[PDB]
Design a protein around this ligand. Structure first.
Ligand SMILES: [Mg+2]
Ligand SMILES: [Zn+2]
Ligand SMILES: [Zn+2]
Lengths: 195, 49, 65, 901, 98, 49
């Protein structure tokens, strides 16, 4: 999967021979939950690695255990790049070149804000409806949800969480200084501040 | 009186208009409503203590 | 007064012609960070040099130096 | 009767002491309770401290305002190991033998280590080595000399539990737990004679007191109850944890004394051990922080005295101060070198106490009568009792009656009060200097221009602060020891620091050039502008051909005293032979006639003889911030007070000529004719073609590479040297053609905002453009900008500007110049950062040293750092360029004054 | 909104399907609800928040069959000035002055 | 840049001659075409495409 080129291929049998003989299959998966949590969790051992592999290794390709098989091929290709440079094949990518730098402007940032806020609403809406089932029991049949809904939204929730995060400049992700107050002295400044 | 970055300005020129400018500020006194039911009431404070 | 007189020129420690037109001494870490290294102990220090002079036979001849 | 603090002797509080210094036993575990009538019988004001509007205390009344809190105690039912001494307790326990009290050493061994205790009684560092050797030697033994050795088990530690791997059946090694009671009863056997052989004291710090038996309670005043919004009492952390102590304590005594199920004692004991550990230090090791029901960790004692933001750097060692002002500065060279202008608005908000005695009684009566409004008024009056009476409200007449000597009036600042001045950052020593107040109408501080190298100030909005000392001892001290005139020479190097700046130097040149004939009207007008005050001796009119008029040298000569003989070559010379034709006529004669060859003068060899400037011209070798050997000599030979008048009168003189004579710079000052322009152009063509030839040599593999560097770097190294010559070669052409008699080069050669390098950089090549050493490499994959062909290492491609600032930069070249200009911007703000921290190190290491009267530098522990200061004995503020007395100067000076007559 | 889609509750009858969002016009209801149009100049002077309502339709899916989508507001989203949906878009010079 | 959905892109290249990953050696095959870092397909002649 890495490469069919013989010169590059001869530098991988070494690495292969040293470790693949010691660890068989699926026991490395066991070692993750071992190394993660020190203290006997026997059942939990396998399952912790599932959490770690799926929620950390390349989450842009997938989150289910079936998606692993795809990242597999992907991970190989990434590794290849490293090995050839030690043999000399390319020229180190300078990270200040504007081809590999992209700006996330005001549009895309506000999406990340709206997503978390809308998530909190849906979660608060679920709990409320459940806490209205035991004390009210049965109402009119097809108009159960059609009233359960409106009583259990309290709209102010989504609204406030949008303002207070944008007006203080401390976003939920951890970034700060996202919003500044528009510097208004002498026309040239405002126009300059917008860019 | 102009050494090391100072500048001398014609007196008459100031006095006829050059570089005159105005500063502005604005205050925002509101009317808070306490939860207990009382309110502020903007009245001339009665000469008391 | 000894502390202040030695800590004042560090502020006025501007550049020099770092790329001189010379050959022999090369990259000896001049500037303000040099002063910091001698003021501290540090067994290790970056780019050491030792100077060797010669006696009265090797003093004026290329093949013997 | 008003003593001062001699010493401080630290130690350990004994249980015995804690009972007398306690005011009451705290027993009720509660706080206030509730919203009205806050008085309990345990932890609150049970003769402990007052905080409420209720006067009750321990008999002394003494309301909450100004009432030092009193301590309490808690009689702990069982002994408790102090966490802070744990590590030391180990050193004591496993180094001595149980039941006896001996240090497990024979008498002989003990006897001889006594003699190492008197020889080491001052150096804390080298005694710690000797304690640990005893420590290490005792730990590896099992044979006490006073119990016959019955097999001594070994101790354990970490974090606060102890064990002993004994034997009891036949060969077992069970781990018997250790209780504080057990430990305590074993330490009281160690006799008092042995504590010096350990790390303790017999009277101040007994070892058994390390096991806490009584806990002293902090007073009420140190435990304030902050309020949250407006009705919530967010209790203090100390109070809560103390309350927690009494709640477990109270159940403890009742639960063991009545029923004894044994099991409870084990759990309850360690919890108390756990709990006390948090009170001493909440950030301890191995101890879950006991928080309040909110998530906020409690800051106990070890987070109170310290925790990187406690009470040394925060409120003790640094404060804002009173009696100050802060504003912008603007220049005015018409006041004396030490005076300062204070805006009249600031003068009325700052006062000084005066203490009327008998000779200024008349003056002050008028001041206090004038009230707080007019300028010579007053604000307060202080009676001998101490109550300050404010002169504002409705009348000031009845105050200004018979004043009665001994009172004190706070008058506004008048002309002559001493005031300091600060720039802030206070880098060198000279940044705070005492000035003399002069008051003028407007709103800036006026600072005389030569005092603006020491502050390192400019004038584009920089702000300065001024504070006014008050007490008579302090005020006097400031005027005698810190005034400006005592600081013309800098302690860093042997040279003058306060001197002429930009216009002062350049104007001095125009006044003293060959042919500066000033008509009679001007001379007369300018001696009245420079303070000096002469009688009817302008005399005698050197040239009367055109009109009766005056040579420039004689007007300048009216300032130097009548005996200064000095001679030195200066910067403006350009003909080393004509200087030397005159250099022998001073040696072999020492007093010639002025007429022969001194009137065959040069413009660069300053010759002054007995108060008369025969030959030479004045530039930055007389005045100025760097070395000037005229102002220098006049402060050594003729005290300090003379120098300020000579400095002051030179300034106002030199300015008056420069103003009335005209000193502009136009745009034609940088212009060269057509022939000289073509001369530069052929140089840039050849230099480019030389670089091309080297590149072609690199391609064909005939390189001939330099020794050290690799082939790729040899190419670059050769190229940079080729172009640096070509830029400087163009500069030689610029220093050759445009004459020395225009108003721009004049500024460059004398030293008044000059460098010949930038005047040439305005009419010739700029040169290469570098970034921290290498040439421009950072760009696209194979080139710098996208306007050149990929793979061009040529001169023009890799950043070499050919056009000057006059003719104008092209788009490629202009962008290259920006890359070189950002370098200077970034650096200057970064270099300051490392300097400031570095200075804090050396100040906090050397501030203790003083010079004793016998000339010896001693540190505060009497360890002599240097026999005869600084390789004796001349102070760097008064020494001559590293040397001392200077025999070469003294000989010529005294021999000339006597032989000349 | 297409990522969440369907979700819970623990009672197996009900469900809620997420429909389509429409973005209204900038309006505000003060004390004693009276919906009136808002302009930017008026908003900055009295401490308001220049925003527009967000309306979502939710589909009660009982036992599998759909019977009645209901559109219900959720709150207020801050609209950028001189953007597309804000009332100042493609307005003539004389009307901006007025 | 504004933004364009990945759908219309992928198809249009593929329809025009992009040879899917199922055929590669690859090196040395005069290949590797990338779409936002995602290695999808190969082609035949570089200058042509
Ligand atoms: Mg400044
Ligand atoms: Zn008291
Ligand atoms: Zn014994």
């Amino acid at each position: 999967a890495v490469s069919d080129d013989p010169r590059i291929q001869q530098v991988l049998f070494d690495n292969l021979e040293d470790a693949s003989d010691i660890s068989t299959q699926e026991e490395a998966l066991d070692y993750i939950g071992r190394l993660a949590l020190p203290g006997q969790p026997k059942e939990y051992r396998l399952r912790r690695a599932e959490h770690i592999i799926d929620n950390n290794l390349l989450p842009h390709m997938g989150v289910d255990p079936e998606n692993r098989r795809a990242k597999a091929y992907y991970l190989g290709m990434m590794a290849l790049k490293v090995l050839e440079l030690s043999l000399g094949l390319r020229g180190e990518d300078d990270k200040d070149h504007y081809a590999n730098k992209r700006l996330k402007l005001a549009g895309d940032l506000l999406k990340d804000l709206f997503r978390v806020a809308f998530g909190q609403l849906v979660k608060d809406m679920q709990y409320q409806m459940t806490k209205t089932y035991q004390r009210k029991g049965e109402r009119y049949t097809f108009e159960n949800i059609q009233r359960f809904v409106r009583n259990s939204i309290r709209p102010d929730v989504l609204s406030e969480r949008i303002e207070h995060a944008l007006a203080t400049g401390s976003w939920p992700g951890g970034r700060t200084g996202v919003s500044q107050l528009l510097d208004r002295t002498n026309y040239m400044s405002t126009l300059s501040h917008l860019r | 009186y102009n050494m090391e970055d100072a500048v001398i300005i014609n007196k008459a020129s100031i006095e006829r208009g050059l570089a005159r400018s105005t500063f502005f500020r604005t205050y925002e006194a509101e009317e808070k409503r306490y939860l207990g039911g009382q309110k502020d009431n903007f009245e001339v404070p009665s000469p008391n203590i | 007064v000894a502390a202040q007189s030695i800590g004042e020129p560090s502020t006025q420690m501007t550049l020099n012609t770092f790329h001189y037109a010379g050959v022999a001494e090369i990259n000896v870490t001049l500037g303000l960070p040099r002063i910091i290294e001698i003021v501290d102990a540090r067994k290790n220090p970056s780019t050491p040099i030792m100077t060797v002079y010669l006696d009265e036979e090797h003093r004026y001849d290329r093949d013997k130096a | 009767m008003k003593k001062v603090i001699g010493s401080i002797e630290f130690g350990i509080l004994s249980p015995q002491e804690i009972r007398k210094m306690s005011a009451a036993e705290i027993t009720v575990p509660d706080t206030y309770d509730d919203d009205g009538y806050p008085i309990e019988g345990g932890l609150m004001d049970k003769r402990l401290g007052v905080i409420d509007p209720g006067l009750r205390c321990e008999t002394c009344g003494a309301r909450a305002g100004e009432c030092p809190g009193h301590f309490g105690h808690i009689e702990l039912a069982r002994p408790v190991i102090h966490v802070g001494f744990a590590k030391t307790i180990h050193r004591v326990l496993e180094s001595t033998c149980r039941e006896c009290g001996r240090i497990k050493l024979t008498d002989e061994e003990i006897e001889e280590y006594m003699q190492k205790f008197e020889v080491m009684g001052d150096r804390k560092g080298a005694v710690d080595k000797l304690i640990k050797e005893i420590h290490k030697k005792a730990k590896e033994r099992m044979v006490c000399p006073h119990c016959g050795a019955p097999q001594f088990p070994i101790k354990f530690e970490r974090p606060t539990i102890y064990w002993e791997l004994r034997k009891d059946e036949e060969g077992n090694e069970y781990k018997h737990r250790m209780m504080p009671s057990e430990v305590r009863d074993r330490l009281e056997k160690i006799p008092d004679k042995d504590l010096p052989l350990l790390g303790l004291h017999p009277e101040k710090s007994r070892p058994e007191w390390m096991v806490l038996t009584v806990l002293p309670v902090p007073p009420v005043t140190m435990r304030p109850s902050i309020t949250l919004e407006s009705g919530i009492r967010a209790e203090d952390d100390l109070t809560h944890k103390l309350v927690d102590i009494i709640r477990i304590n109270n159940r403890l005594k009742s639960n063991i004394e009545a029923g004894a199920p044994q099991l409870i004692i084990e759990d309850l004991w360690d919890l108390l051990q756990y709990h006390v550990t948090t009170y001493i230090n909440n950030e301890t090791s191995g101890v879950p922080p006991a928080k309040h029901k909110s998530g906020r960790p409690l800051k106990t004692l070890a987070q109170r005295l310290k925790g990187k933001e406690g009470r040394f750097r925060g409120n003790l060692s640094g404060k804002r101060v009173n009696f100050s002002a802060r504003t912008v500065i603007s220049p005015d060279p018409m006041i004396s070198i030490n005076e300062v202008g204070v805006p009249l608005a600031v003068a009325m908000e700052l006062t000084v106490p005066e203490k009327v005695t008998e000779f200024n009684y008349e003056k002050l009566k008028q001041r206090v009568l004038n009230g707080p409004e007019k300028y010579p008024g007053a604000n307060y009056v202080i009676d001998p009792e101490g109550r300050r009476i404010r002169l504002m409200e409705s009348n000031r007449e009845l105050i200004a009656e018979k004043l009665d000597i001994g009172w004190t009036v706070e008058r506004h600042l008048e002309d002559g009060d001493v005031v300091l001045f600060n720039r802030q950052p206070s880098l060198h020593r000279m940044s705070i200097m005492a000035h003399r107040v002069r008051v003028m109408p407007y709103r800036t501080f006026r600072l005389n221009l030569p005092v603006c190298p020491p502050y390192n100030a400019d004038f584009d909005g920089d702000e300065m602060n001024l504070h006014v000392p008050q007490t008579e001892e302090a005020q006097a001290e400031a005027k005698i020891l810190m005034e400006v005139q005592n600081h013309i020479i800098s302690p860093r190097y042997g040279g003058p620091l306060i001197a002429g700046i930009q216009d002062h130097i350049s104007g001095g040149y125009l006044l003293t050039r060959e042919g500066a004939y000033f008509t009679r009207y001007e001379v007369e007008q300018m001696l009245m502008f420079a303070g000096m005050d002469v009688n009817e001796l302008p005399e005698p009119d050197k040239y009367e051909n055109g009109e009766p008029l005056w040579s420039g040298k004689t007007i300048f000569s009216l300032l130097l005293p009548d005996d200064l003989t000095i001679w030195y070559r200066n910067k403006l010379c350009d003909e080393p032979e004509r200087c030397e034709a005159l250099e022998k006529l001073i040696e072999e004669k020492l007093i010639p006639d002025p007429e022969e060859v001194r009137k065959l003068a040069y413009d660069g060899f300053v010759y002054i003889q007995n108060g008369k400037l025969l030959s030479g011209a004045v530039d930055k070798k007389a005045y100025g911030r760097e070395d000037g050997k005229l102002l220098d000599i006049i402060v050594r030979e003729y005290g300090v007070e003379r120098a300020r008048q000579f400095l002051d009168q030179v300034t106002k003189l030199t300015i008056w000529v420069i103003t009335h004579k005209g000193f502009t710079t136009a745009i034609d000052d940088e212009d060269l004719p057509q022939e000289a322009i073509d001369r530069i152009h052929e140089i840039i063509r050849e230099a480019e073609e030389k670089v091309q030839r080297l590149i072609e040599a690199y391609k064909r593999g005939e390189l001939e590479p330099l020794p050290g560097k690799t082939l790729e770097e040899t190419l670059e190294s050769k190229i940079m040297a080729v172009l640096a010559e070509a830029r400087d070669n163009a500069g030689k052409v610029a220093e050759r053609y445009l004459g020395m008699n225009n108003h721009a080069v004049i500024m460059a050669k004398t030293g008044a905002r000059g460098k010949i390098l930038n005047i040439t950089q305005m009419a010739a090549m700029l040169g290469q453009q570098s970034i921290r050493g290498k040439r421009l490499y950072r760009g696209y994959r194979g080139r710098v900008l996208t306007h050149f062909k990929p793979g061009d290492l040529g001169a023009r491609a890799r950043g070499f500007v050919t056009n000057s600032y006059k003719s104008g930069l092209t788009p490629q070249e202009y962008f290259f110049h920006a890359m070189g200009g950002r370098e200077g911007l970034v650096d200057t703000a970064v270099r300051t950062a490392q300097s400031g921290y570095m200075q804090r190190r050396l100040i906090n290491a050397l501030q203790d040293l003083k010079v004793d009267y016998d000339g010896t530098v001693r540190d505060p522990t009497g360890i002599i750092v240097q026999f005869k200061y600084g390789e004796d004995g001349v102070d760097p503020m008064k020494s001559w360029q590293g040397k001392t007395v200077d025999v070469d100067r003294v000989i010529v000076r005294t021999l000339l004054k006597m032989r000349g007559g | 909104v297409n990522e969440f889609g369907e979700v819970v509750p623990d009672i197996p009858n009900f469900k809620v399907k997420f429909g389509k969002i429409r973005i209204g016009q900038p309006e505000f209801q003060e004390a004693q609800g009276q919906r009136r149009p808002l302009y930017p100049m008026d908003a900055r002077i009295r401490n308001l928040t220049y925003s527009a309502p967000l309306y979502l339709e939710m589909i009660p899916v009982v036992n599998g069959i759909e019977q009645e989508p209901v559109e219900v507001r959720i709150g207020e989203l801050p609209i950028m000035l001189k953007s597309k949906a804000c009332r100042l878009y493609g307005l003539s010079d004389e009307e901006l002055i007025k | 840049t504004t933004g364009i959905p990945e759908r219309e892109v992928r198809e249009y290249l593929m329809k025009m001659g992009v040879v899917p990953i199922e055929e590669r050696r690859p090196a040395p095959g005069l290949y590797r075409v990338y779409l936002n870092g995602v290695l999808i397909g190969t082609v035949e002649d570089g200058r042509k495409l």
